[PDB]
Design a protein around this nucleic acid. Structure first.
Ligand SMILES: Cc1cn([C@@H]2C[C@@H](O)[C@H](COP(=O)(O)OP(=O)(O)OP(=O)(O)O)O2)c(=O)[nH]c1=O
Ligand SMILES: OC[C@H]1O[C@@](CO)(O[C@H]2O[C@H](CO)[C@@H](O)[C@H](O)[C@H]2O)[C@@H](O)[C@@H]1O
Ligand SMILES: [Ca+2]
Ligand SMILES: [N+]
Lengths: 412, 554
DNA sequence: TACCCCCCCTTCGGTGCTTTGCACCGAAGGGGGGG
């Protein structure tokens, strides 16, 4: 019995019509059990084929969750409600969240089931549950409350959320709280013991307002950037200098101060690749000056809230993965490198999935956005396995690229 | 009127009205069997008379029911469907017998006048207006509107499937141990109950469907195996496809090969080893479907051995959820692959094939990865789980590929099977330059207008070559320059190029290509023992790259 | 001269980077199959 906030799509835009992809047996059993109890509690109700809209749905397990968690792929619906959660009921982003020594993420998605949904918008929350071997045709549902994973849900609940948080935001003034969809980010500079205690206080503070919490521990101050580094060799071959000049030539698109005229002089002949080349006086100095420019920050790089974030990932082999986050080309907002993640030395798709999750988490903490990914993988390879390793309650936009490593710019 | 079951609200696309198109000049031979059953629909409330107050019209014809003397009524709603609202089909796929679990007793039954047993929406009935012809053009004929789902409408299938589930839901909840495969109006009902108690629960469901006005005719009812279901022959412990007839035409057209290709693709699901490569090479770039085309000696051999597979009858087994799923793949050559999915050895659940040529340049390892992904998706559809793979590729061969490839790739839990021909990498680029090997600085260039170009190289030992090229592109000269250095070099060679295009193709280690020039490069790379490829930027005064850039530009 | 769903094989045309050539992909028409 609560007033329903009216929601409309972007001007001149139709609802989402995305096909449901096949699901494994353990995910279908989990979804049928979850959707059954969600129907007897009135959170969802079955519909028919007169609804031309549909959105994919599957199940996940969070890190060490052991319990199944329903997840809807509202990426297509969110792109068609972009006018809502950005212009109207947007959330300002706390720039100090990335400065706290510890940040904890909590799944507050179960509270959205309390607030009902606008009746005219429930026709867009349609999803279909498949059956194994097509034993039964598609069983379609619709959300009567705020759906988990829809970007318009935390915006509507924001008025209710800030009232629940106001007593604790006053009892602890300097503790930062940010809300991104079904997740709640709380950070403090307190010690690890004091921090985890105030989390439980916030858990009980949310219990008396009718919410459970089925916690991820981050350290944004520990995050380090990955710079472009030049090798250290006591003797240089022709092939070493050729790879080096090509790397500095590519790096000149980022740091314009890179020069190669004194290193190209060493290559003026037609020499064998394994032939050792001693460095001249000007080449050692040109190399010394270039190493210093790569130490400097890129000139004129800053975040634009009106632009989308782009994330590129490069597979470096042996468990190493590099990534860059940018809005404009060669104006990277952050570069990084991941190693020894789950699935290393055995599963490339699991490592890439873990990398996408870690990059998106960092982007939410630093800028409050999710970047669009350029994934170094084939479309069919990714769309086959990525659901088996996804452990987050959000899903970012992605595309697939195929760029061979003509020059190893980001990792030696 | 009378309301049998719950209706479904329908609309039109906003700002559009109903269908107003004239009828076809139908022959009087079909009008006899048309007005026959058409007049019988009014008595049952399926169709009703309408006055001139209804300004809609749509054509109507009729075809014979396959393998039957009775006639089927069809209504052309092509203009109505263009202006009717969009739906979302609840039919997500097709059930396969390989996913069926073994049941002690099985029953199959068809629904008489299926579409005609579901009531249409009240306010939408007016748009189904159509007129009925006669023997002469003097009598006008009564105009009708549909009170039920008509055959020929784009919304009839989706509404029937959804309404059928709501009727079967109370029975499914009362009988949880009963397996009901619902597909349109055909129902597969199986259980572990004794055959005595099984036919009792069957009649319990036939009464439950009759309670909502759904007929279960005994002629469509099947009580004894082999059950004809989805084009298969279901036996108590095995299954097989219904017999497949291959055309015996002496002279083949395009429509003949297309019928032959589809028959083989359908047979490939249980008959192992079906190949359609050489038969499909005949239908490329052809204009007329009626055009006659001769059979190549390759396709003649392919059709012969494919007929020998269909000569001996084969069968599949049923799914045992307790035992694991095993999928074994074999290479057939020329980008052709077949697989068998089984649980007990030599007792296949189903078979299949993957022969898609993806990309201009590829290798056997890529195509095996694509086949595994096709089987995984197919297996998750049918059984909801990923099978254990037996692949004809060495464990160390796969390890070398995915670890060195720049793109992420993976294969699920698999083991090596020593069934030739084995999948292998035919050459390996060195990670570091080769000491003592000659270093070839290659480059190429071509004129955009003249289409002429040069391709050559310069080495550290003084070796050199330039070759004029006719009707070429900038990319072909860069590939040609690499071909020359491979020809005129020893067993070990260092190659330095500036072409990002050529280097990207070769580093993926292809063994096949649509470009004949790339195939010759592959032929040379297999002959070599050590090849090192390196890239440098052009016009930077680098190595022999600056010297060879001058030669190919003069 | 009807509707809806799944599959493979080919062409073609739009897309973006490998660039005004070359490669890729998704829609579409051919067939098989289901009701
Ligand atoms: C073959 C076919 C089927 N249907 C669907 C399936 C079914 O929902 C219904 C026709 O079904 P029925 O006539 O009931 O099926 P049937 O042919 O076995 O006949 P019946 O039982 O009277 O002896 O429309 C079409 O609309 N067009 C076709 O070309
Ligand atoms: O409608 C697409 C919506 O979801 C994503 C990614 O999963 O795209 C998906 O759905 C698309 C359907 O055309 C396909 O790209 C594929 O199903 C899948 O990638 C989003 O990237 C997009 O917003
Ligand atoms: Ca029937
Ligand atoms: N050039």
């Amino acid at each position: 019995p609560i007033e329903t906030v009216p929601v409309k799509l972007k001007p001149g835009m139709d609802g989402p019509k995305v096909k449901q992809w096949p699901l494994t047996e353990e995910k279908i059993k989990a979804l049928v059990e979850i959707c059954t109890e969600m129907e007897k509690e009135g959170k969802i109700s079955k519909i028919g084929p007169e609804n031309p809209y549909n959105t994919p749905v599957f199940a996940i397990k969070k890190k060490d969750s052991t319990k199944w968690r329903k997840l809807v792929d509202f990426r297509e619906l969110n792109k068609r409600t972009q006018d809502f959660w950005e212009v109207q009921l947007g959330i300002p982003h706390p720039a100090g969240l990335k400065k706290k020594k510890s940040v904890t993420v909590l799944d507050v998605g179960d509270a959205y089931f309390s607030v009902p949904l606008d009746e005219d918008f429930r026709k867009y929350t349609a999803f279909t549950i498949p059956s194994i071997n097509n034993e039964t045709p598609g069983i379609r549902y619709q959300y009567n409350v705020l759906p988990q994973g829809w970007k318009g849900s935390p915006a509507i609940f924001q008025s209710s959320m800030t009232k629940i948080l106001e007593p604790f935001k006053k009892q602890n003034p300097d503790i930062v709280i940010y809300q991104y969809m079904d997740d709640l980010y709380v950070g403090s500079d307190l010690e690890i013991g004091q921090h985890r205690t105030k989390i439980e206080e916030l858990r009980q503070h949310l219990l008396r307002w009718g919410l459970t919490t089925p916690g991820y521990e981050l350290h944004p101050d520990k995050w380090t950037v990955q710079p472009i580094v030049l090798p250290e060799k006591d003797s240089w071959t022709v092939n070493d200098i050729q790879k080096l000049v090509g790397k500095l030539n590519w790096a000149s698109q980022i740091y314009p101060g890179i020069k190669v005229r004194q290193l190209s002089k060493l290559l003026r002949g037609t020499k064998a690749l394994t032939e050792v080349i001693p460095l001249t006086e000007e080449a050692e100095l040109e190399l010394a000056e270039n190493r210093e420019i790569l130490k400097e920050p890129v000139h004129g790089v800053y975040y634009d809230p009106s632009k989308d974030l782009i994330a590129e990932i490069q597979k470096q082999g042996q468990g190493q993965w590099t990534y860059q986050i940018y809005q404009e080309p060669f104006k990277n907002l952050k570069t990084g490198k991941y190693a020894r993640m789950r699935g290393a030395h055995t599963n490339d798709v699991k490592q890439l999935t873990e990398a996408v999750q870690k990059i998106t988490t960092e982007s939410i903490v630093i800028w409050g956005k999710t970047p669009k990914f350029k994934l170094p993988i084939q479309k069919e390879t990714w769309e086959t396995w990525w659901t088996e390793y996804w452990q987050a309650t959000w899903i970012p936009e992605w595309e697939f690229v195929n760029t061979p490593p003509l020059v190893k710019l980001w990792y030696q | 009127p009378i309301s049998p079951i719950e209706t479904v609200p329908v609309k039109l696309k906003p700002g559009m009205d109903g269908p107003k198109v004239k009828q076809w000049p139908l022959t009087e031979e079909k009008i006899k069997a048309l007005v026959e059953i058409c007049t019988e629909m009014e008595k049952e409330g399926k169709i009703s008379k309408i006055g001139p107050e209804n300004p809609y019209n749509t054509p109507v014809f009729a075809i014979k029911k396959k393998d039957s003397t009775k006639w089927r009524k069809l209504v052309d709603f092509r203009e109505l469907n263009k202006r009717t609202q969009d739906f979302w089909e609840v039919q997500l796929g097709i059930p396969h017998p390989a996913g069926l679990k073994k049941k002690k007793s099985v029953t199959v039954l068809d629904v008489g006048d299926a579409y005609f047993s579901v009531p249409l929406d009240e306010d939408f009935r007016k748009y189904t207006a159509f007129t009925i012809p006669s023997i002469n053009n003097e009598t006008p004929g009564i105009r009708y509107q549909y009170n039920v789902l008509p055959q020929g409408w784009k919304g009839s299938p989706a509404i029937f499937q959804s309404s059928m589930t709501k009727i079967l839901e109370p029975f499914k909840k009362q009988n949880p141990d009963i397996v009901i495969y619902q597909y349109m109006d055909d129902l597969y009902v199986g259980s572990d109950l004794e055959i005595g108690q099984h036919r009792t629960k069957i009649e319990e469901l036939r009464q439950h469907l009759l309670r909502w006005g759904l007929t279960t005719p005994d002629k469509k009812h099947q009580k004894e195996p082999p059950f004809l279901w989805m084009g298969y022959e279901l036996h108590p412990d095995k299954w097989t496809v219904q017999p497949i007839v291959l055309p015996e035409k002496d002279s083949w057209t395009v429509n003949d090969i297309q019928k032959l290709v589809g028959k083989l693709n359908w047979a490939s699901q249980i008959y192992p080893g079906i190949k359609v490569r050489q038969l499909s090479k005949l239908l490329r770039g052809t204009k007329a479907l009626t055009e006659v085309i001769p059979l190549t000696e390759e396709a003649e051999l392919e059709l012969a051995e494919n007929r020998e597979i269909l000569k001996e009858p084969v069968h599949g087994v049923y799914y045992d959820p307790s035992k694991d799923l095993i999928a074994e793949i074999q290479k057939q050559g020329q980008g052709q692959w077949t697989y068998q999915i089984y649980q007990e050895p030599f007792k296949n659940l189903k078979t299949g094939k993957y022969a898609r040529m993806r990309g201009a340049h590829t290798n056997d390892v890529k195509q095996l990865t694509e086949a595994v992904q096709k089987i995984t998706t197919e297996s998750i559809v049918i059984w909801g789980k990923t099978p254990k793979f037996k692949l004809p590729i060495q464990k160390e061969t796969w390890e070398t590929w995915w670890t060195e490839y720049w793109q992420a790739t993976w294969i699920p839990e698999w083991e090596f099977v020593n069934t030739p021909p084995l999948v292998k990498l035919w050459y390996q680029l060195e990670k570091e330059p080769i000491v003592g090997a000659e270093t070839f600085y290659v480059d190429g260039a071509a004129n955009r207008e003249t289409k002429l170009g040069k391709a050559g190289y310069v080495t550290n030992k003084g070796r050199q070559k330039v070759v004029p090229l006719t009707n070429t592109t900038n990319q072909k000269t860069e590939l040609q320059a690499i071909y020359l250095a491979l020809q005129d070099s020893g067993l070990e060679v260092n190659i330095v190029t500036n072409s990002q295009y050529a280097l990207g193709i070769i580093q993926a280690q292809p063994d096949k290509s649509e470009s004949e020039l790339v195939n010759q490069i592959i032929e040379q790379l297999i002959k070599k023992e050590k090849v090192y490829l390196a890239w440098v930027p052009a016009h930077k005064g680098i190595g022999g790259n600056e010297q060879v850039d001058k030669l190919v530009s003069a």
